[PDB]
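Aim 2 progress update. The chain analyzed this quarter is reproduced below.
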Amino acid sequence: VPAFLFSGSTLSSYRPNSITIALPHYVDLPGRSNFKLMYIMGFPIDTEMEKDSEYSNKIRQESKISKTEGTVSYEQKITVETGQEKDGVKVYRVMVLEGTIAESIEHLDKKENEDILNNNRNRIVLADNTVINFDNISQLKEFLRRSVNIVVNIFEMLRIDEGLRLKIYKDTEGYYTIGIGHLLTKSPSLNAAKSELDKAIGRNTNGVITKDEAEKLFNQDVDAAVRGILRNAKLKPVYDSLDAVRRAALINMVFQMGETGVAGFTNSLRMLQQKRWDEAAVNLAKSRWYNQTPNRAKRVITTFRTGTWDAYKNLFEH
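Predicted structure tokens:
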């Protein structure tokens, strides 16, 4: 029996449709297969059954991500649930439905949710529909913090390696650009750039932005890169094998040279995938890359080599 389930608040972007709400209402999540939610008292409920049911979800297989060591870092949204499990039957209230890591972090820290979380088993349901079960909420909060750190660090990493501009400027190719990566428009017009930027930010910019906005844009860019990395038969196996800091170095390289450029370091990638770090490092130092942007290559390589933030640590939050 799930303990507190109607207690506390639930953070969800999704809003389905004085009333009938007392009654059970079943719904399929708009974007995903085998997410069937049951709403009583306005509360999202995830249910799993070994058997077959019209209103219940098929059993979910457990993801390979380590609850002690691992990260959700490059996932877009995640789901968080508390509840109970006994053979064949699982019942979990949804505390956060497809929210960001930061969002989930703050939401699980609300004292009103405090009751329902310390009394039940807590799990995360990934966008690939695999779950990571946690021993306790403190551990889960650790897991989430450790993930958001990687997210804030990758921005700093790129700020330092690539550069961060707060005014519209031009690409080495002529294109209006702002922040770190971000391309506004391929059109020759500055008003077209400014108008694109206002649309993306949703305020009147006049071509200048805060660091925070640039960070938002950059996160969209990290997702487009990760989506392209996993589509590329040359990058995917390497990226899959790397821990989160090292993936940050891989993404860094993709941001600088393109998917196609990174795919050309064939031997250095095989070396990375075999976890031979010093060889990979030596090999990577052979390229014109290392010669042309030596400071950035040196830090990226140090990062590949150590799995830590040591090349960037003193420079952070600058």
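The chain has two domains: 1-156, 157-318. Residues 137-162 form the longest helix (26 residues). These observations will guide the mutagenesis experiments scheduled for the next reporting period.
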